[PDB]
UniProtKB/Swiss-Prot annotation, chains A, B, C:
Recorded disease: Phosphoserine aminotransferase deficiency: Characterized biochemically by low plasma and cerebrospinal fluid concentrations of serine and glycine and clinically by intractable seizures, acquired microcephaly, hypertonia, and psychomotor retardation.
Protein residues bound to O-phospho-L-serine: H39, R40, H330, R331, R337
Native organism: Homo sapiens (Human)
NCBIfam families (alphabetical): PRK05355.1, serC_1
The protein's assembly and partners: Homodimer.
Gene name for this UniProt entry: PSAT1
Record's keyword annotation contains Cytoplasm: no
Name of the featured protein: Phosphoserine aminotransferase
GO CC annotation terms, alphabetical: cytoplasm; cytosol; extracellular exosome
Length: 365, 365, 365, 366
């Protein structure tokens, strides 16, 4: 009955959890758990190679790219990306596009490893994407960074921005494998698995093979792309269970139609909620501009643009009473945030859509 | 049945694995999985806090020590310890006591963050602990590092070394909570969970509160002791499932007598195997001197001190037939290695002892 | 359990059936049943007018197109469209495109009212759409008739054919509102409600308001478009409960994203089965050319192109054991047929997908 | 306050029937699906439509040489189907019609699209009597003879089977089907829309003598041709599945309540109660129908005088609505008031109308 709208960690497919439970003590007859499996065993090698193959198949990752699994989460790459690539040009300069709290947090962290320049003026509110033609690009910057889907503010890119040839690093934790991606146009793609492709503990990094070996001396070996790609993500003990869990979610995404089907489902799910917001006569207020609205995270306010606290509290109370969890928005924005990742089914969204329709009919004047 | 002598990741109690399977779809009635549980929820707040209380209770950790859980493994702390502590004194000096492959791997990693001096002369073989008298310690060094138990060579510190009052950093990955420890005498203790306390993905780090804030600028925020201690290991999304697993094994260690029983049990298991080697008339050979023999990892050879490849291959084949897994020694030293961690029961080592006894009764001339 | 893959009548949305049950004895407080309700009441006026507005909204029906609700089902319009239109031009001639059994049946029925020419050469097997250019069109033919989706053979038009300006009559019974349709290019559209939009009893007809009045003298008044349009489908007692049922299913279609979202789900469901048949190495055989493959009805054979009767029997038996109903193919073609109409959810097709995968895994040589 | 539904068609259904439909609306008898989801070619629905035909034959004593089929199109559809299937029975394509009200007139007009229609009796100044059969001018070369047993709008009902000198007899019993026993052997075709007396709207029952098939015209739709449908056992195409299932439940209800024989005596009790209030009303209620042709199903009347007091008739219908007595307003073509007393309308219901009519008269009569 529970409907999980968690932002990250998020809901996993009910079928996947069932298989994890069934073979938790005896993984496919081997006689041990995955939690007990040695990463150097023949059994676990099959698992991590399976997960890598699925990432390449679902995203159509070209052969000239390395797919590695690292620890540290998404914030772990906020440090790993500068340590590995800011030395690509001697200037130690990097361009960062700040559209929300996660690219903002990633830009601050990047200052520890070089001179970082934000490409646009600070917005009064994270409600739109600055026009790419208004970008002040440093031609001598090592790379250009941006976040494809801002989990907190609901700002999402529906394009690959033109960085005039610079190597492009992208933060896709909030929409990884929610749509087909042209991997060739990037330099490094990373995403914490705990949002749309698995459980917390493991982070996927897709690196172009010509960008290895530019890591600074202060880069940890466990976070250096050249080291981990040189050991097939087995330089040290990797999060074995988080990779096994992720492999099942990938297998689930494949059986449901790859990334092209996840793109269509995200359109149906997000639009079902957005139609109610646009037709709410101001009852529900999404501050993001229509052209940059996220399809994975929908933050809105109730009553007015600043939010009626009593009205939003009774919204979350009846939501919890109806067993719809984790609808409260992030602490920095407040209000309501609905997360609609791959595992969140249409029935889940329909449950919320009917609830938002009846909450309006009984509170709107 | 199956007996898992894994060196890391290693065997977990059957009591623990049974509970993880039972609650995997609906943890304690909340309606979701731990894999779906958000690290900001009151539910997960209870899990990670209870894990800290157990770490402080079972080890009797003083109140002036911070207990944080980080990603990256013990190989991650090989860079985190220099990042957080090598700037404790302006010289960027540190003393390392290489007693095995993991100690040497940590010192080599630490050379990217300062000037590393290996304390004692390089032994021809990792067969003993150099007497602490012969230790040449720079008194203006930031810290002194050593590995209490070497996984590949089976040399263990049955004492806390006298570093003449310097801050002491130790690597107890392979013997953490295998015995009581006087925490007050240490500066920083770190251990990977995956070979005595739980599943891979998380690392315990016990740091004295006065040692925070000396981190370098290149230290990733997810690996800075000051940062994670300020957010109670929730600065970013932590390995939620790995801390849930660790708490259950910690609870299991508590019900079975705590650290005082873990040392008494680890004596019976190591004595039962070491007496067989000492009575083999050369059939089994352990090159480690008895005053440094590990109670956790017992590597040995068959036939002669150099290793009879014919007898050792037949030893592992017959062992695999008896469903005794992961007895093959590390890929560098070769031979046999028996890991006798906390979850390894006395019945488990008795099956190994009976197998070693009868195997000698069929191949000794 | 129970997963209904019915050809027609087909599955209804579980939410709809729940509301029909809740208000069967007291429809919205009026005090009576819709079964007891008079078609000349103001209450049924809201019902039939709301159903009309949904047909107009969901299909974007122009204001110069009449929408009437008749009895007689699909085969009723096989006689209704010639009686109403074959006399548009003095020749009493009509062009008919036969792509399957249902277009052939309508072609045979039209022979009772004029000169009926089949446009293409007769096909050896209904596996492809004869290319629109090889069509022998009559310039003086009163109308051109084709079937958008052949329910028995799985041949669906993914395009609106060019008939050189003739009035176009299409039979969309088995794909009505499964995809957006350009109503302006059609002259008469009809669809039996029982397959994708309602329950058996009522037929939707969309007629351009300038094609009325060409009715032959022998056209029954209940089926004459001019008469029923001039009485708002109330010339006689209409199938009230069937119209009320369709109004709720149309409401369900709207709440789930309209005709745009139905098409995206149609592709996900249909391709999920087609991928299984194509990757089956000849175990499942679907004769339809891939460009004309229906997204609603998927008929195939098991074992070989001719069909392994013994193998197909275990399939339908085991499928019935798993509560997957009405998967037996049509009696004239045999074999299997999966009907994936609007109410059939992705969860349902995934069950059918996992079943076909395992069945192949256990019976292929 | 419970609703009293005097609906003229669609009309009231038995409460216990509506309870069963509601009960098994999502899981019909454990099959796992609804009747609304049921395939017409399944064994489950095969029992439903066969049990419905068996009930029609049993309750009406239909001889074995008659076909019982369930068609769509309502009664007005049969207005075309009867000439389409039968007007070609004789070469002249002639048909005799007996017009006693609005529905027999509407049927005679519709039959002119398929042949030469002749009304056998001189026109009636008002639909208040059945013209004496001795005054009928019957064509011996007519394919059939048509008449309407019960006129819903005008309240004129046959209490006899007319002698058509041996012709093929066709009768429209939609508003009195299974309200009384019928000697089916006297008829060639009997049809009745189910929405009025034996279920819900959507399906039409037709009883055809098996030797009358195969005279259909080329222009008869296959779904309305008796030969085609009787050959496929009403399953030439998808039939109104739910309406055939609802009809069987109403038929089973009639059987459990005494069958056609009991429905006739109950219809007498109900109609008498109202007709006695009218005749004793001293002109306050005015029913122009002559007593020997008064219908036991539909009782239309006026208030005040023969032409109708509109104010008094407006207060009557308004006070009846606040008492939850629905559909008492007469047909829009005649106006006035129409009380329909079909099988499902209980004696307690007619009593509520009877008491209200006595209280309304005691309060406005002069
Ligand atoms: C394309 C198309 N046109 C007409 C019909 C029939 O509608 P009806 O005339 O209302 O039955 C149908 C109904 N299809 C059903 C018909 O099955 P049937 O042979 O009637 O049992 C099927 O495919 O099984 C249809 O799919």
């Amino acid at each position: 009955q529970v409907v999980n709208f968690g932002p990250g960690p998020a809901k996993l497919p009910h079928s996947v959890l069932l298989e994890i439970q069934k073979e938790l003590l005896d993984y496919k007859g081997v006689g041990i758990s995955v939690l007990e499996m040695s990463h150097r065993s023949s059994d676990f090698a099959k698992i991590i190679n399976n997960t890598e193959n699925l990432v390449r198949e679902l995203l159509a990752v070209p052969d000239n790219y390395k797919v590695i699994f690292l620890q540290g989460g998404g914030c772990g790459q906020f440090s790993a990306v500068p340590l590995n690539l800011i030395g690509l040009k001697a200037g130690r300069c990097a361009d960062y596009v700040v559209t929300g709290a996660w690219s903002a947090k990633a830009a601050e962290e990047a200052k520890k490893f070089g001179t970082i320049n934000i490409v646009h003026p600070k917005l009064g509110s994270y409600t739109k994407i600055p026009d790419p033609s208004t970008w002040n690009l440093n031609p001598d910057a090592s790379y250009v960074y941006y976040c494809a889907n801002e989990t907190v503010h609901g700002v999402e890119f529906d394009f690959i921005p033109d960085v005039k040839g610079a190597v492009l690093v992208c933060d896709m934790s909030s929409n990884f494998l929610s749509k087909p991606v042209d991997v060739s146009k990037f330099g490094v793609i990373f995403a914490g698995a705990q949002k749309n492709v698995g459980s917390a503990g493991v982070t996927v990094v897709i690196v172009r093979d010509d960008l290895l070996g530019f890591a600074l001396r202060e880069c940890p070996s466990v976070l250096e792309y050249k080291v981990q790609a040189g050991n097939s993500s087995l330089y040290n003990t990797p999060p074995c269970f988080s990779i096994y869990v992720m492999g099942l979610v990938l297998e689930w995404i494949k059986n449901n139609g790859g990334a092209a089907a996840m793109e269509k489902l995200s359109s149906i799910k997000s639009q079902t909620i957005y139609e109610i917001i646009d037709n709410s006569q101001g009852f529900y207020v999404c501050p993001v501009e229509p052209q940059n609205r996220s399809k994975m995270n929908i933050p809105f306010r109730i009553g007015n643009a600043k939010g009626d606290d009593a009205l939003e509290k009774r919204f979350l109370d009846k939501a919890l009473e109806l067993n719809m969890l984790s609808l409260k928005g992030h602490r920095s924005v407040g209000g309501i945030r609905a997360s609609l990742y791959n595992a969140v089914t249409i029935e889940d969204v329909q449950k919320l859509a009917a609830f938002m329709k009846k909450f309006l009919e009984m509170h709107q004047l």
